[PDB]
Amino acid sequence: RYMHNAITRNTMFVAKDKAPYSDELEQPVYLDPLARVEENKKKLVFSDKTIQSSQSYV
Amino acid sequence: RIILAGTLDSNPIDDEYGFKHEIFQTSADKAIKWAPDWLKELRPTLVKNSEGKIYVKTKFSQLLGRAPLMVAGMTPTTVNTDIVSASLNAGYHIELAGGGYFSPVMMTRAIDDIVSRIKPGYGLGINLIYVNPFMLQWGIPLIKDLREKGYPIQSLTIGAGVPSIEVATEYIEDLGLTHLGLKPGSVDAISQVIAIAKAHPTFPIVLQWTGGRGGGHHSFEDFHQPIIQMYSKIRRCSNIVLVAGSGFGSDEDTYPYLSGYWSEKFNYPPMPFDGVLFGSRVMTSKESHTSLAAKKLIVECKGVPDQQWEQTYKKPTGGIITVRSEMGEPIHKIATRGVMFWKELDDTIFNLPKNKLLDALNKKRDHIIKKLNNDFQKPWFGKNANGVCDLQEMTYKEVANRLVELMYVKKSHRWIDVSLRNMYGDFLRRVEERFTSSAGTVSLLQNFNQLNEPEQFTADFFEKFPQAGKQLISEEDCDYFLMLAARPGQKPVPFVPVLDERFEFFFKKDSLWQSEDLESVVDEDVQRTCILHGPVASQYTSKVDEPIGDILNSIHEGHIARLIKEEYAGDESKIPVVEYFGGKKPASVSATSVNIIDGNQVVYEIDSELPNKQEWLDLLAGTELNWLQAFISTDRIVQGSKHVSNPLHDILTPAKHSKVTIDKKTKKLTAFENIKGDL
Amino acid sequence: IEMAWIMGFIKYHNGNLKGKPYSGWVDAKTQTPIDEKDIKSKYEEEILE
Amino acid sequence: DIRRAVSIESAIEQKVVNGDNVDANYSKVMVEPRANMKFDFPTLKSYDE
Ligand SMILES: NC(=O)c1ccc[n+]([C@@H]2O[C@H](COP(=O)([O-])OP(=O)(O)OC[C@H]3O[C@@H](n4cnc5c(N)ncnc54)[C@H](OP(=O)(O)O)[C@@H]3O)[C@@H](O)[C@H]2O)c1
Ligand SMILES: Cc1cc2nc3c(=O)[nH]c(=O)nc-3n(C[C@H](O)[C@H](O)[C@H](O)COP(=O)(O)O)c2cc1C
């Protein structure tokens, strides 16, 4: 699906503009080896509930 | 009559009042220019036909020779060729819903089925919609040569807009109609109508007044206040026949409007109405193609008094709300889950400008799709892997199966439209075009007529193309699908395939016919359906599937009984009796019956100069109503359900040295003329 | 058709093309619709060139 | 040449008598082919296989 859409609309490569983390989260992700992106609004973004969460070590 | 005895500068252009001199006109008695007395002049009266039938002689009934109770011409209901015919035979007049036909040939066929089924000689009208320049592109030229062939189309009502004056000239003079109907909604539209009538003081014009309390399309203006300013300046145009509708369902419901005693609520003279048309009252008739569940729903929805019809813009008022059209014109519709969803959508998404529309749809996508599959009639198309989904995540086979399920009624083994059949076929043409490679071979689809039972054809077809059951729809075959779904000249798609700026373009267009066939509804739940109806009229729609003839007869009889009790003292013998009803004015309207000389054994010579034509015809007619007076005065001669011009209406043109002989109480007319000196 | 697409021979035009609605492959130089077969027979000489 | 010309003549004679409205229906509606660019991840064999 993606390839067909792209090769038709010349958007195979979509340049990223903002990182998955936010500037206020760009460090706290770096220190947690378990904080990983969750998805919302059809976007894969880092949150705060994922950083140093108490449930990612069950 | 008002006489401005102070000043002598006569006269006002419309002769509203007299001046100083009108005291002095000393011609033997002719001075007494009386004032229009609406309560006396055009009061509803009774008249017995020679067959013993009793009619309500009005200015309108007198025009149509039948009861003063006509049927509007709604596009969904009135387009069915059965309801309109089965009520013409009931004796009441109907205008055919021209809106429901997109092709001249289809309308011509429907007309021909009408003519074959109505009584020989009856005539019908055609309701057109002025804001469809395509429909007036081919309808008007059709009416021209059709009337030229002489089909019994006796009227053309131009609803949803009043034409300009010079185009009304064409509407009147060229196409040989008997009466022209107009549906004004604004006081300025009424001014335009009067500007029209004064241009052709002899061609009758039926003014159909509909307030805002009506059904279907909708008008903002109140029902009374417009006419309460124009009743006077209308009645000063003798050609305009005024008919009020928009929410009438019972005999006593409308009786004050016929009598005119309705103005008492406003401390005004009684202002009688000529005729009364009907809208939503008839949709529950047996002879209507309204879905049984839809009729049941209509009977369910309670009415709303006129004092509180304006609250329809907010809440379900007895189960009826208005809502903006594709173009923002209000449209009174019954209140179903689908209709509530319609209103909510118009309220939040469609009111927005173009820009944020995409985003609003994006943040509301799943919620929209929820009710579009739950409450609306054009459901969300994509449905794959047991989940609602987008289009581009469906295999070809399941795409085709969904198209079948949403465009072919398995119960009646028919297509919603053959043009949809052709769309489906044109899509399979692309499927096979795709999944084949350098073949130059025969297509499994040679004739789209194979598709008249797709259920098995496609099923066996996907064997020659197995992987189309598993490869998803490609995009170039998806955008093509959409481009099909909105090709011109095709019936609009019965579902919604996407969420884009054209959302309403798929959501609202052609949202009317489904009330006729709820079997095309995904679950045949009327709550998906868009049914048009009038708020105030609903408080009378209590019986379902009653014959269309009975309704109008049930109310005409109530009117007759009331008018007998009131203006004839409960004695029917006092009712005047005429042989036939129509054509000549029996009440002395401003028509030349005084120069009509009636007699038993009469001869009167004539020369080339005296007289002109019309009054000569009248002289020949005689005052009273006899077959000869009819035949000499009738405008129309029926030739086996045709309406061709009257032969005598020109062959008896005044001529030099001629003479006519009407002797032995009109038992024979005998016209003479001079030949070679002999007569 | 892929080598045509990356060499800039065809461009998937969509929408209205000279009035008619269109969703398909189009030449890149004159911008006229082209079936999926004429791709080879029409460009294979140039592509390999 | 005679088997060509007599064939042409009897074809056009039929196209006149039968009319040119059904003779197009004798020519079968052949299928144009499209391209079917998939992506086609490498085919997974079955486990036991
Ligand atoms: N005054 C009132 O109270 C009142 C009440 C109800 C409705 N109305 C009016 O009456 C109209 C009723 O029509 P609608 O709203 O149901 O239609 P619609 O949703 O406005 O869509 C009609 C369009 O679809 C196309 N179409 C429809 N059927 C077709 C067929 N069988 N074949 C090919 N093309 C077809 C037509 O294209 P073409 O251009 O090719 O014809 C036409 O432009 C409305 O537009 C409304 O304004 C007024
Ligand atoms: C079921 C139904 C279908 C209608 N279809 C049309 C139409 O195709 N064109 C039009 O100008 N008015 C249409 N109308 C409006 C009526 O002609 C009239 O203006 C209104 O019904 C009068 O209001 P009332 O029903 O309360 O007397 C329709 C009304 C109803 C109830």
Contact yes or no for B215/B188 (Cβ under 8 A) = no
Q: How many CB atoms lie within 10 A of CB B351?
A: 11
The experimental technique used to determine this model is cryo-EM
Q: Atom 25, ligand 2: which residue's CA is nearest?
A: B279
Distance CA B209, CA B365 (A): 43
Q: How far is CA B165 from CA B162, B189, B591, in A?
A: 9, 12, 26
- Name chain A contacts of B393, Cβ cutoff 8 Å: 1
Q: How many CB atoms lie within 10 A of CB A14?
A: 7
Max intra-chain CA distance, chain C: 35
Resolution of the model in angstroms? 3.3
Distance CA B90, CA B477 (A): 54
How many distinct helices (H) and strands (E) make up chain A? 2, 2
Q: Examine residue B611 and say whether the peptide bond preceding it is cis (omega within 30 degrees of 0).
A: yes
- Name chain D contacts of B447, Cβ cutoff 8 Å: 25
Contact yes or no for B330/B216 (Cβ under 8 A) = no
- Name chain D contacts of B428, Cβ cutoff 8 Å: none
The torsion angle over the Cα atoms of residues A26, A29, A31 and A34, rounded to 10 degrees, is -170
Q: Is D32 close to C1, i.e. CB distance below 8 A? A: no
Angle at CA B90, nearest 5°, toward B87 and B93?
A: 60
Contact yes or no for B39/B566 (Cβ under 8 A) = no
Distance CA D44, CA B161 (A): 67
Contact yes or no for B283/B298 (Cβ under 8 A) = yes
Q: Atom 26, ligand 2: which residue's CA is nearest?
A: B247
- The alpha carbon of B331 and the centre of ligand 2 are apart by a number of angstroms equal to 10
Q: Is D36 close to B435, i.e. CB distance below 8 A? A: yes
Using alpha carbons, select from B100, B90, B99, B101 the residue that is nearest to residue B124.
B90
Contact yes or no for B155/B179 (Cβ under 8 A) = yes
Identify the DSSP state of B638: E
Max intra-chain CA distance, chain B: 103
- Residues forming beta bridges with residue B381, ordered by sequence position: none
Instruction: Tell me if chain D has a CB within 8 Å of the CB of B202.
Output: no
**Number of A–B residue contacts, CB under 8 Å:** 12
- Residues forming beta bridges with residue B47, ordered by sequence position: B55
Q: Is residue B43 within 6 Å of ligand 2 at its C-beta?
A: no
Residue of D nearest to A3 (CA): D39
Tokens of B510: 């052609």
Contact yes or no for A46/A21 (Cβ under 8 A) = yes
- Residues forming beta bridges with residue B584, ordered by sequence position: none
Residue B107, burial from CB neighbour count under 10 angstroms (0-12, 13-18, 19+): buried
Instruction: Tell me if chain D has a CB within 8 Å of the CB of B445.
Output: yes
Tokens of B287: 């002879």
Max intra-chain CA distance, chain D: 66
Question: Judging by DSSP bridges, how do beta strands B95-97 and B124-129 pair with one another?
Answer: parallel
Distance CA B375, CA B340 (A): 9
Beta-carbon contacts of A27 under 8 Å, excluding residues fewer than 6 positions away, are none
Tokens of B174: 């060229």
Distance CA B44, CA B42 (A): 6
Q: How far is CA B512 from CA B111, B286, B623, in A?
A: 21, 19, 51
Q: How many CB atoms lie within 10 A of CB B137?
A: 11
- Residues forming beta bridges with residue B637, ordered by sequence position: B644
Contact yes or no for B254/B272 (Cβ under 8 A) = no
Distance CA B404, CA B424 (A): 8
Contact yes or no for B375/B522 (Cβ under 8 A) = no
**φ/ψ of residue B158, rounded to 5:** -105, 90
User: Which ligand places an atom closest to the C-alpha of B138?
Assistant: 1
Contact yes or no for B182/B174 (Cβ under 8 A) = no
Using alpha carbons, select from B500, B461, B508, B462 the residue that is nearest to residue B483.
B500
- The SS3 of residue B303 is coil
- Name chain D contacts of B451, Cβ cutoff 8 Å: none
Nearest-Cα distance to chain B for D27, in Å, is: 10
Distance CA B291, CA B53 (A): 35
The torsion angle over the Cα atoms of residues B561, B566, B567 and B570, rounded to 10 degrees, is 60
Contact yes or no for B548/B286 (Cβ under 8 A) = yes
Residue B139, burial from CB neighbour count under 10 angstroms (0-12, 13-18, 19+): buried
Contact yes or no for B283/B71 (Cβ under 8 A) = no
Distance CA B94, CA B123 (A): 9
Question: At B230, which amino acid appears?
Answer: M
Tokens of B102: 């997109």
Tokens of B16: 């509203």
Q: What interhelical angle do B476-485 and A2-9 show, nearest 10?
A: 80
Distance CA B254, CA B208 (A): 15
Instruction: Tell me if chain B has a CB within 8 Å of the CB of C38.
Output: no
**φ/ψ of residue B647, rounded to 5:** -60, -55
Using alpha carbons, select from B362, B403, B368 the residue that is nearest to residue B382.
B403
Q: How many CB atoms lie within 10 A of CB B487?
A: 14
Tokens of B58: 């009005």
Beta-carbon contacts of A23 under 8 Å, excluding residues fewer than 6 positions away, are none
Helix (H) or strand (E) holding C15: strand C10-17
Q: Which of B327, B329, B407, B509 to mutate to test the pocket of ligand 1 (most atoms within 8 A of CB)?
A: B509
